[PDB]
Amino acid sequence: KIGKTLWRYALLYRKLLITAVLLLTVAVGAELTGPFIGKKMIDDHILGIEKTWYEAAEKDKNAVQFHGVSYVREDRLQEPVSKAKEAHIYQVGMAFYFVDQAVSFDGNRTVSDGKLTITNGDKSRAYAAEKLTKQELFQFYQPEIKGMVLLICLYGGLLVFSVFFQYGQHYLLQMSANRIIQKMRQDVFSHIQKMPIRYFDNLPAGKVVARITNDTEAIRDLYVTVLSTFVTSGIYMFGIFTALFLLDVKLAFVCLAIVPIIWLWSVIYRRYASYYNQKIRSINSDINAKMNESIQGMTIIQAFRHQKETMREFEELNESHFYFQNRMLNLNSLMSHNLVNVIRNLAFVCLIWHFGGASLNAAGIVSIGVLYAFVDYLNRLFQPITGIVNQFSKLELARVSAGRVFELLEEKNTEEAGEPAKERALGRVEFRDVSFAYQEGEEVLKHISFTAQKGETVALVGHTGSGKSSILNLLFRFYDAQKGDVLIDGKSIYNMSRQELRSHMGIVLQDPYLFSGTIGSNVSLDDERMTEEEIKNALRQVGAEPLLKKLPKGINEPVIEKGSTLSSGERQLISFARALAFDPAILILDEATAHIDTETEAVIQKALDVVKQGRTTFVIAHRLSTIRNADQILVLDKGEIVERGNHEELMALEGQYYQMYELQKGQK
Amino acid sequence: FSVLKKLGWFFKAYWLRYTIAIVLLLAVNVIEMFPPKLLGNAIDDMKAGAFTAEGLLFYIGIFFVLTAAVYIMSYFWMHQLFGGANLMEKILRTKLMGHLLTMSPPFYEKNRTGDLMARGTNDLQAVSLTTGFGILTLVDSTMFMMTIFLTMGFLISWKLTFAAIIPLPVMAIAISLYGSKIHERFTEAQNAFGALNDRVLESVSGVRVIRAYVQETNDVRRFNEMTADVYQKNMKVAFIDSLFEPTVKLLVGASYLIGLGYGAFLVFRNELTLGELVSFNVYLGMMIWPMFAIGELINVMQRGNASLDRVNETLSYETDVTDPKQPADLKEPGDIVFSHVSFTYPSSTSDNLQDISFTVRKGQTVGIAGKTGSGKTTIIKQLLRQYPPGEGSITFSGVPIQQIPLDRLRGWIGYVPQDHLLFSRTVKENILYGKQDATDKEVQQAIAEAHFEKDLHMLPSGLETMVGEKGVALSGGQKQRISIARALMANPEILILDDSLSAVDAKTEAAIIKNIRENRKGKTTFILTHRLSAVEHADLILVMDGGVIAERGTHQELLANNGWYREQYERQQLFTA
Numbered sequence A: 001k002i003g004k005t006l007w008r009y010a011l012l013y014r015k016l017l018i019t020a021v022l023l024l025t026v027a028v029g030a031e032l033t034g035p036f037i038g039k040k041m042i043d044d045h046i047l048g049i050e051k052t053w054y055e056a057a058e059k060d061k062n063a064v065q066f067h068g069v070s071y072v073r074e075d076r077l078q079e080p081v082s083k084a085k086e087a088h089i090y091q092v093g094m095a096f097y098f099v100d101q102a103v104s105f106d107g108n109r110t111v112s113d114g115k116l117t118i119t120n121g122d123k124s125r126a127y128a129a130e131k132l133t134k135q136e137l138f139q140f141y142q143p144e145i146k147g148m149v150l151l152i153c154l155y156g157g158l159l160v161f162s163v164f165f166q167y168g169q170h171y172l173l174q175m176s177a178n179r180i181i182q183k184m185r186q187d188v189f190s191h192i193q194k195m196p197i198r199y200f201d202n203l204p205a206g207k208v209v210a211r212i213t214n215d216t217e218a219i220r221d222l223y224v225t226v227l228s229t230f231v232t233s234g235i236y237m238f239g240i241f242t243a244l245f246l247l248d249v250k251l252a253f254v255c256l257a258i259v260p261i262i263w264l265w266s267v268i269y270r271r272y273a274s275y276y277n278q279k280i281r282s283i284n285s286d287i288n289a290k291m292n293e294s295i296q297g298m299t300i301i302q303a304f305r306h307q308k309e310t311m312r313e314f315e316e317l318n319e320s321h322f323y324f325q326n327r328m329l330n331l332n333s334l335m336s337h338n339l340v341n342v343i344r345n346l347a348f349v350c351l352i353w354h355f356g357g358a359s360l361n362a363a364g365i366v367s368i369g370v371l372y373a374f375v376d377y378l379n380r381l382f383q384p385i386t387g388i389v390n391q392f393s394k395l396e397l398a399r400v401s402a403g404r405v406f407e408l409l410e411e412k413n414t415e416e417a418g419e420p421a422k423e424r425a426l427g428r429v430e431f432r433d434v435s436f437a438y439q440e441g442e443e444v445l446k447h448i449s450f451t452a453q454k455g456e457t458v459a460l461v462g463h464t465g466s467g468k469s470s471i472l473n474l475l476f477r478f479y480d481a482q483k484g485d486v487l488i489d490g491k492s493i494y495n496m497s498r499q500e501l502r503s504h505m506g507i508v509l510q511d512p513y514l515f516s517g518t519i520g521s522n523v524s525l526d527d528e529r530m531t532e533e534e535i536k537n538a539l540r541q542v543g544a545e546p547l548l549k550k551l552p553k554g555i556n557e558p559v560i561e562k563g564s565t566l567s568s569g570e571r572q573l574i575s576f577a578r579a580l581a582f583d584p585a586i587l588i589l590d591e592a593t594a595h596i597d598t599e600t601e602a603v604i605q606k607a608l609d610v611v612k613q614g615r616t617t618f619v620i621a622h623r624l625s626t627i628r629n630a631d632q633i634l635v636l637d638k639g640e641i642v643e644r645g646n647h648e649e650l651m652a653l654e655g656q657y658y659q660m661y662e663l664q665k666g667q668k
Numbered sequence B: 001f002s003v004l005k006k007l008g009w010f011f012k013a014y015w016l017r018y019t020i021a022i023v024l025l026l027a028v029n030v031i032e033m034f035p036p037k038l039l040g041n042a043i044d045d046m047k048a049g050a051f052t053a054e055g056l057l058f059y060i061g062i063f064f065v066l067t068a069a070v071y072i073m074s075y076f077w078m079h080q081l082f083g084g085a086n087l088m089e090k091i092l093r094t095k096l097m098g099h100l101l102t103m104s105p106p107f108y109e110k111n112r113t114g115d116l117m118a119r120g121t122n123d124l125q126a127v128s129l130t131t132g133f134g135i136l137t138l139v140d141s142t143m144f145m146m147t148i149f150l151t152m153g154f155l156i157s158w159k160l161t162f163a164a165i166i167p168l169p170v171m172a173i174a175i176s177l178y179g180s181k182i183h184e185r186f187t188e189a190q191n192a193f194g195a196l197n198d199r200v201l202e203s204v205s206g207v208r209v210i211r212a213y214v215q216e217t218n219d220v221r222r223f224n225e226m227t228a229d230v231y232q233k234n235m236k237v238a239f240i241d242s243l244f245e246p247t248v249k250l251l252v253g254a255s256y257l258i259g260l261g262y263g264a265f266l267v268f269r270n271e272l273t274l275g276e277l278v279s280f281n282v283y284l285g286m287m288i289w290p291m292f293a294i295g296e297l298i299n300v301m302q303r304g305n306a307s308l309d310r311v312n313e314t315l316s317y318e319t320d321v322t323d324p325k326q327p328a329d330l331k332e333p334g335d336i337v338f339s340h341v342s343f344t345y346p347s348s349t350s351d352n353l354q355d356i357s358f359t360v361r362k363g364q365t366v367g368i369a370g371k372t373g374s375g376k377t378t379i380i381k382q383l384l385r386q387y388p389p390g391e392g393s394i395t396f397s398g399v400p401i402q403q404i405p406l407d408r409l410r411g412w413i414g415y416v417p418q419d420h421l422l423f424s425r426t427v428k429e430n431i432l433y434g435k436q437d438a439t440d441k442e443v444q445q446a447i448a449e450a451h452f453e454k455d456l457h458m459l460p461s462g463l464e465t466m467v468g469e470k471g472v473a474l475s476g477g478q479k480q481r482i483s484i485a486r487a488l489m490a491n492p493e494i495l496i497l498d499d500s501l502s503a504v505d506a507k508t509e510a511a512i513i514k515n516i517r518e519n520r521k522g523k524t525t526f527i528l529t530h531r532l533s534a535v536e537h538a539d540l541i542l543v544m545d546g547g548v549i550a551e552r553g554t555h556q557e558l559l560a561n562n563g564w565y566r567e568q569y570e571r572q573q574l575f576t577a
């Protein structure tokens, strides 16, 4: 699965996630209580005048004074006597009318005289009403200015606290994501270092590099999305529903019903956008590949007058991709944005319908404060829907990348090792009896038998595939022979740590593997244990080029060209120097500068001689002239050592080596 | 904006669609101001003692009507505008691909494939986004913003709107600053990740050395250091990324708070109403977006300007290197002759080719050879119209090639590039570039002529497999033989075989050469190679050293003198085999 491993990696670094969740919850609570401040500020202060007023003497503060008498509300009122002398400030049209006595229900109110009759279902009574001046109405509004101020200040304080906590919870979510991905990358790279070379051979470098880095960035994006778009929104939708239910239970069921709308819309949009985005991506990749192969290969396209057919295919791809772009545009418009706005308008219609039904029932109105809070909570709710559906549709690529990474991490086959060597072996290596097949059946080594004594320069000669690079692979335990035995000194290769084995022996393959950095970075591979490389390198005949290449002292940093900064001969020189630095007992030489169409033989033979001394050099040089001074010439007849002996001994028999040497020398 | 001015051709081409889009955009923007005001009016009619089922039904019906309206008009203007953006994408694709199909080698020498692919994959996207979304944002920042501002000013109040709007400009400025400063750190973090990618590739390609010097732990150490650096850069980016939500939340909560509080202090003074206090809230809620639209516009306009400037530089700034003129009426080539062809290779100070007085008569199989780097391939690159004519003359029976139309000359020459340049198509289709009208039998005839029938037989007959993507059984010799098969299928008057067969066996090369000269002796042929066996029978052999010719004699005359006795050298190779 994918969720299981993602959750397992998320449980690591749980303190950060829990802190982020809690800070998000606190900030959410502050933000959502804001609109409750708004509702209270509307109802209790702006709409407080409508509440009943009771007449009282000039004894209590906040008791508003009208004409010669002073009244005070039913809330900012101590209780000397409730009695029955009640006065109201009714509203009809845009006018506020003062009623000095009113004990009855409230309904539709009209004024043609001082009657201020209330109709409701049927007319009940008419009360002598008086119009209130603008200043008098304010006097009836003044007592609530201080509550206004306090609610505003509370609203600002909660705002700043929410600011701080939002910043904190976002920073912690991102820190958690980046720490998890760093852990994943470290683990994947370690596994790569503990992977068999067989896996490396089949897959190209690009695929494994992608698995290490690009897929883990996809995981990063997934964690960011799930954290900062689904958990946050879930906690932002739970709090909103809590507030709405605290406001009005009956209406909130409308939003409980809205949730299925979100579910169905996301499902449909995913179903269609997956198809359209897949086709768009597949055709855009085809367009880019066609463009690349047309630029790369333009000459013959023009020479053979194929400019009227390649353009036709390119236009087919372009038209298809454009058509799918149009279809995606149609779906995107319809499903996303016109729908968000339509649902918002439907919510407004539902608000009006519900509150109107309430207000038509004997003028029993649910506070307009509830309406404002609902309008402020529903505007909040609809903001993140489009992003939610987009991410829900887009999760599939991250899912695939996660699958690839977690299949790499779960590969059972591995190489367990990591123990260096203890003492130098002086260079004894033998192949008493071995047989190697890469996969099955096809044998590249058949009953190979040789014993390379302390005598060095044991050479393998062949061409077009006989099992020499197979011998090299067997020597370093890159591939296991699955049959026979191999020994260095008296020990068996298959009875010791890989690091110990490879600690005895060096290697310089055909292409000198140059690493970005300084020259000293190459000679020591950034070992940091060996101190003096130049001085030792001074004995390796590298005293000319480094002086030419500026003033390296191991600080040149020239390899930024990936190797092109130097010459091929210089690259082989540095490879030989690195091999000499570690001073391995054995030195397995592949085709080193003897690759193709080359004449500068002495230029590298001079270093080859310097590295020859005091080792057991296994050389697979194809140029038999350079190997004539070898001691144990080995000829591979497609998996068999048909002949054995020095160059003179092989020449006398004239089986295959004499003929090959004659051809190679005479042709020159 | 400059990008919009430079895109004048596109807009003039498509004016009905874009004018419809703009008109519908403005109509929807104006219609959208009604819902909030109708909600405020409903609230007011609720508070005042006048609200009947008639009015409520009126409000529900009008809301539904406006909803359906804005829905349909939204669909149609979005369709028109974004379909226009897609059409611009298509137009730029066609233009770029056609121009590239027109261009010649020097243009590709001056411009790397990376820039061309970036232009064909990035700048087109930027320009299309300009055309559609930048226009949308211009209409959102110039018409929706001012419409909302003046609607709030007139239909609500002119002090509440002024007070409850101050934080929005500050929010826009802060958003722009945070965008710039986060993009900088994002570039830094992407640079660090690229370094990580390079190191991982370097330590997964050269794994043999790493594991054969037991350095697979210092490698882990270096990777851990660079992963830590990537994480640190990613934290530095986050430090500025996390400021976008707090700032907008603060400067929108301040706006809402000012609106609500200062509407409360106005409802007290009787300069507003609850419905007008609810509609103002909704208007601010819908106004919070033009603030982002301003920044998105100022960004997309400049990005599109740069991308369109690059697209024009690749498209128009570059002229075709070689062009035809009044085409002389020559039906076939006669006796190709070079009088004094002193070609100065572009991007090369040295002449690289001095005067060459060599003439090839109809059917006179020529053959060229010499030291590597002797400029023996420049002959055919002169014969192929690839590069500028330079100084000299190449007359096809008195009419210089610079006069014959490019199409006819291309029809005459059967070109076989030395570098195998096959395409990722079926082998059969790969062989049909020379003749697209082949009836599938001359294909087999030419395959036999190239002796490719036997080697093609072993390959699975799955539509002759595919070469470029992954050769089922492919080798250099096979690619040379298929290229020769294409050239033969072209049935050309002048056959150019540059490094004809440097991969196939000597016997196979000799057999193919004999076959070609057998069925095309009456037609001219050019042979360039290092192995003198291929030009053994040619009746005009020029050996080129440096940038000039040495001897114009036949093979017997060439072997008579020892100025270039590589033939004697390979005679031992002939003895060696």
Ligand SMILES: CCCCCCCC/C=C\CCCCCCCC(=O)O[C@@H](COC(=O)CCCCCCCCCCCCCCC)COP(=O)([O-])OCC[N+](C)(C)C
Pocket: A326, A327, A329, A330, A342, B064, B065, B067, B068, B069, B071, B072, B075, B079, B083
């Ligand atoms: C009292 C009532 C008030 C309203 C009165 C109004 C009455 C008006 C009545 C009708 C006019 C609108 C419907 C037109 C149908 C035919 C269109 C056509 O030719 O097909 C077109 C597709 O069309 C579509 O994409 C579907 C129709 C688009 C409009 C929105 C959906 C209609 C349902 C709304 C109802 C739910 C509303 C929800 C809110 C409540 C094909 O052409 P194209 O589009 O150019 O194709 C471009 C190619 N591309 C797609 C690949 C990019």
Ligand SMILES: CCOc1ccc(-c2nc3ccc(-c4nc5ccc(N6CCN(C)CC6)cc5[nH]4)cc3[nH]2)cc1
Pocket: A337, A383, B082, B085, B089, B124, B125, B126, B128, B129, B130, B132, B133, B289
């Ligand atoms: C092909 C390469 O070039 C491109 C060309 C065009 C587009 C493109 N296609 C688009 C489709 C829709 C939108 C878009 N539609 C929107 C509707 C509303 C909003 N808002 C308004 C306020 N609300 C609250 C949130 C944001 C943003 C919106 N953005 C943008 C688009 N940009 C992309 C790449």
Ligand SMILES: CCOc1ccc(-c2nc3ccc(-c4nc5ccc(N6CCN(C)CC6)cc5[nH]4)cc3[nH]2)cc1
Pocket: A030, A031, A032, A034, A035, A158, A159, A380, A383, B248, B249, B250, B252, B253, B254, B256, B288, B289, B292, B293, B296
């Ligand atoms: C205590 C109460 O105080 C409050 C605090 C915060 C908010 C508040 N909640 C919000 C929710 C969403 C938005 C918002 N409005 C937007 C408009 C457009 C866009 N886009 C889409 C994405 N791209 C970048 C273009 C711009 C994003 C948007 N995000 C603003 C918001 N402001 C309200 C009251």
Ligand SMILES: Nc1ncnc2c1ncn2[C@@H]1O[C@H](COP(=O)(O)OP(=O)(O)OP(=O)(O)O)[C@@H](O)[C@H]1O
Pocket: A201, A202, A438, A439, A442, A443, A444, A462, A463, A464, A465, A466, A467, A468, A469, A470, A591, A620
């Ligand atoms: N990855 C592989 N999987 C399967 N078989 C392989 C693989 N690599 C090589 N072989 C087999 O090995 C042979 C190719 O030559 P081999 O690897 O034995 O050495 P080589 O190429 O002669 O070495 P050198 O480079 O020194 O000439 C063939 O039999 C081929 O199928």
Ligand SMILES: Nc1ncnc2c1ncn2[C@@H]1O[C@H](COP(=O)(O)OP(=O)(O)OP(=O)(O)O)[C@@H](O)[C@H]1O
Pocket: B345, B346, B347, B348, B352, B371, B372, B373, B374, B375, B376, B377, B378, B379, B418, B499
């Ligand atoms: N792309 C180029 N740009 C500039 N000069 C070039 C280019 N390619 C070749 N030259 C010049 O041409 C000389 C050799 O030309 P030419 O390719 O005809 O020789 P060749 O090596 O015998 O041929 P080929 O390699 O095609 O078999 C080079 O030394 C260099 O001077």
Ligand SMILES: [Mg+2]
Pocket: A462, A463, A464, A591, A622
């Ligand atoms: Mg070899």
